[PDB]
Amino acid sequence: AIKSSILSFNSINEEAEFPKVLLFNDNYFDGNIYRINNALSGIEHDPMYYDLMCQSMKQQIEKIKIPLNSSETISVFAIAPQPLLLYLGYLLNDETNIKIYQRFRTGNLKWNWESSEITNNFYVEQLYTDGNEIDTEVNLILSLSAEISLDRIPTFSNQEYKVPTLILRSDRQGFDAIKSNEDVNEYISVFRNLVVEKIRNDFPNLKCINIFPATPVSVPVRMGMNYQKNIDVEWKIFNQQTNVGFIYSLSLKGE
Ligand SMILES: Nc1nc2c(ncn2[C@@H]2O[C@@H]3COP(=O)(O)O[C@@H]4[C@H](O)[C@@H](COP(=O)(O)O[C@H]3[C@H]2O)O[C@H]4n2cnc3c(N)ncnc32)c(=O)[nH]1
């Protein structure tokens, strides 16, 4: 009832600290730790990295769904490229008995929350005036850990092809944009209600959201859990990579 298992994913070892974090959050470790292996470490370089990592993660999560779903609570400590954190949340896709933790740069317990209340506000800028019935794609910039300047987003030169764009920002940007679970809960509410659902209201024939993110670890995992399989449109996530800009990584997609 207070019992929690641990799920650990590190592809970028603080595992000995995780039971202590549970105790600070009304839990205690139940003895079940599920380690998601970094299967294709060494091939982080070539353009098949995300395809191959997703296949490994999917197989690893399927083999433990029976023990996983038997957990009273699952406490998740995941740090990886944002697309794989999104995919992890998609594989877990269960907002109810799952607690997603955030890693901080300083502190006695790097993975314990720095606050128990809302510390930030999240808000939307839209770079278009009106929706329409023609556009099928939207660009979504997530500027939490840093402000992604618009010159970094692939943008079509001709006006008839320019993709409508929205930005989701926080009042406080930086590595501590998320300090509490309350912060993430509020982010996810804004993301779902004022971004994802708003975009589909504005563009009723939407097929795809292109995501360009600078966010801390808890945010992509919680967005992946928030994905509504076969209901949401395709979410294509791009990744900032050295000397190349934002490159397409992977999609969350219906079947
Ligand atoms: N500063 C900055 N970052 C940008 C910009 N455009 C894209 N980014 C990407 O966003 C991520 C922000 O870094 P973060 O530390 O707040 O969160 C990362 C991220 O959730 C996950 C994977 O890291 P990475 O692929 O490098 O993505 C980084 C950036 O490239 O892990 C988090 N992370 C990485 N290192 C740590 C750490 N020591 N402690 C806690 N979390 C970490 C841009 O313009 N500016």
Numbering used by the authors: 122 to 133, 142 to 384
Please give sentences taken from the publication describing this entry:
Here, we present the biochemical and structural characterization of two CBASS systems, composed of CdnG and Cap5, from Asticcacaulis sp. and Lactococcus lactis. We show that CdnG from Asticcacaulis sp. synthesizes 3′,2′-cGAMP in vitro, and 3′,2′-cGAMP is the biological signaling molecule that activates Cap5 for DNA degradation. Each monomer of Cap5 is composed of the N-terminal HNH domain, the C-terminal SAVED domain, and a short flexible linker connecting these two domains. The structures revealed that both Cap5 form homodimers, resulting from the side-by-side packing of two HNH domains.
